[PDB]
């Protein structure tokens, strides 16, 4: 039971300790391809790399590298591609991935600029009339419409394969109110955002995996994936109270390092799941 485990830890300030156990137990696999000199400019951060076993490969024979990991949750039957906020030189790669993997949605959990510096390139067009063209991966992207709201914005985009002239509609789910430091006071809006993403059908099997990212694609992105999955499991099992969030986090960490960067995010994850649970039924 987590609802209880929560308070047991809160009034004991053991969050930092728990988080560390998880850090210690977490798996570690090689990232040999990510470290090759030729991909130095394909990584935003030197110490956030995709393991080789689970990395997303680009269908180009030149350089199939991109800092992106496939997180496959067998039991919950859900997959997610967690990636880093793209770089000024990897946007064409990013959309190539979205195309090749047949993704339907892109979930963005950060802003282009935070704490005064760029945390992600401006990879999507901001004005209907100014479409972007990525010449290296031969892709065209057009802003079709956007719906700006209190805590988030949803955009409909048209991605076209210039080689084939085939078009596809991608939904951009951009959470715009994640705080500069710390985590939200209330998981409330984050849960609404999540459900909003589920509702679009972007997390569904008939589509390629959803593309999720913040700046490094492991902290906030981790809380998103960890919350979704845990909620899905509490919904699928005979015994809902059998869902161990730490267990799930560790399973996800087999596919990508550092998912959930601080003890705060972990606490927040608990909160989002606990809150989301008291609502998936009434
Ligand atoms: O982008 C992330 O994965 C992330 O969650 N980061 C954070 C790390 C600690 C506390 C808060 C956050 C946050 O995003 O709110 C990171 C932000 C910027 C650079 C990072 C570099 C490596 C790992 C995590 C990073």
10 Å CB burial of residue 24 (0-12, 13-18, 19+) is exposed
User: Per DSSP, what are the bridge partners of residue 156?
Assistant: 145, 171
Token representation of residue 18:
């728990």
Q: At what angle do helices 263-280 and 15-25 cross, to 10 degrees?
A: 100
Residue 84 has which token pair?
């880093």
Q: Among this protein's residues, is 214 annotated catalytic?
A: yes
Ordered by start, the domain boundaries in the chain are: 1-282
Closest by CA position to 230, among listed 242, 256, 255, 248: 248
What one-character DSSP code corresponds to residue 207?
Answer: S
Which one is the CATH code of 1-282: 1.10.8.100, 3.40.50.1000, 3.90.190.10, 1.20.120.140? 3.90.190.10
Experimental method: X-ray
Q: How far is the CA of 90 from the centre of ligand 1 (A)?
A: 19
- Rounded Cα gap, residues 260 and 66, in angstroms: 21
Report d(CA 1, CA 18) in Å as an integer. 16
**54: helix, coil or strand?**
coil
Q: Hey, which of 86, 182, 219, 249 would you mutate to test ligand 1's pocket, going by the most ligand atoms within 8 Å of its Cβ?
A: 219
Atom of ligand 1 nearest to the CA of 110: 14
State the burial class of residue 240 (Cβ atoms within 10 Å of its Cβ: 0-12, 13-18, 19+): middle
Could you tell me which of 234, 226, 242, 223 has the C-alpha nearest to residue 280? 234
How many Cα atoms are found within 13 Å in the side-chain-facing hemisphere of 162? 14
The DSSP element (H or E) to which 71 belongs, if any, is strand 68-73
The set of protein residues with a Cβ atom below 6 angstroms from ligand 1 is: 45, 48, 214-221, 261-262
**CA–CA gap between residue 68 and residue 55 (Å, rounded):** 6
Please tell me what resolution, in angstroms, this structure has: 2.4
- Give the Cα separation of 150 and 156 in Å (integer): 18
- Which of 31, 91, 120, 214 is an active site residue? 214
Q: Report the C-alpha gap between 222 and 174 in whole angstroms.
A: 15
Q: Which of 106, 78, 73 lies closest to 249 in space, CA to CA?
A: 73
Q: How far apart are CA 6 and CA 277, in angstroms?
A: 14
230 is in an annotated binding site: no
Which residues, other chains included, contact 167 with Cβ-Cβ below 8 Å and sequence gap of 6+?
A: 158, 159, 160, 161
Integer angstrom CA distances of residue 45 from 133, 170, 237: 26, 27, 38
- CA 132 to chain centroid, in Å, comes to 23
| Cβ–Cβ < 8 Å for 63, 57 | no
Instruction: Give the pairing type, strands 139-148 and 152-161.
Output: antiparallel
DSSP result, 15-39: HHHHHHHHHHHS-----HHHHSGGG
Tokens 């967690």, located at residue: 82
Residue tagged 């996800």 (tokens): 252
| 3-class state of residue 216 by DSSP | coil
Count of beta carbons in the 10 Å neighbourhood of residue 221: 31
Q: With beta carbons less than 8 A apart as the criterion, state whether 32 and 50 touch.
A: no
Say which residues have a Cβ less than 8 Å from residue 4's Cβ, sequence separation at least 6: none
Do residues 159 and 139 touch, judged by C-beta distance below 8 A? Answer: yes
Specify whether the CB–CB gap between 38 and 63 falls below 8 A.
yes
Q: Note whether 214 and 221 are within 8 A (CB).
A: yes
């Amino acid at each position: 039971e987590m609802e209880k485990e929560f308070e047991q830890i809160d009034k004991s300030g053991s969050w930092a300790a728990i988080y560390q156990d998880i850090r210690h137990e977490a798996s570690d696999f090689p990232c040999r391809v990510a470290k090759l000199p030729k991909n130095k400019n394909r990584n935003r951060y030197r110490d956030v790399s995709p393991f080789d076993h689970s990395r997303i490969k680009l269908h180009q024979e030149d350089n199939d590298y991109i800092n992106a990991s496939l997180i496959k949750m067998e039991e919950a039957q859900r997959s997610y591609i967690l990636t880093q906020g793209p770089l000024p030189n990897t946007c064409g790669h990013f959309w190539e991935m979205v195309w090749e993997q047949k993704s339907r949605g892109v979930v963005m959990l950060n802003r282009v600029m935070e704490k005064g510096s760029l945390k992600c390139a401006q990879y999507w067009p901001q004005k209907e009339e100014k479409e972007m063209i990525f010449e290296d991966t031969n892709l065209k992207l057009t802003l079709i419409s956007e719906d700006i709201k209190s805590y988030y914005t949803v955009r409909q985009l048209e991605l076209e394969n210039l080689t084939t002239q085939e078009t596809r509609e991608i939904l951009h789910f951009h959470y715009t109110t994640w705080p500069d430091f710390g985590v939200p006071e209330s998981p409330a809006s984050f849960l609404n955002f999540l459900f909003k993403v589920r509702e679009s059908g972007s997390l569904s099997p008939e589509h390629g995996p959803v593309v999720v990212h913040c700046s490094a694609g492991i902290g906030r992105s981790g809380t998103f994936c960890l919350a979704d999955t845990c909620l899905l499991l509490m919904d699928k099992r005979k015994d809902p109270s059998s869902v161990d969030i730490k267990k799930v986090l560790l399973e996800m960490r087999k596919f990508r390092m550092g998912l959930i960067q601080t003890a705060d995010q972990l606490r927040f994850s608990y909160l989002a799941v606990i809150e989301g649970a008291k609502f998936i039924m009434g």
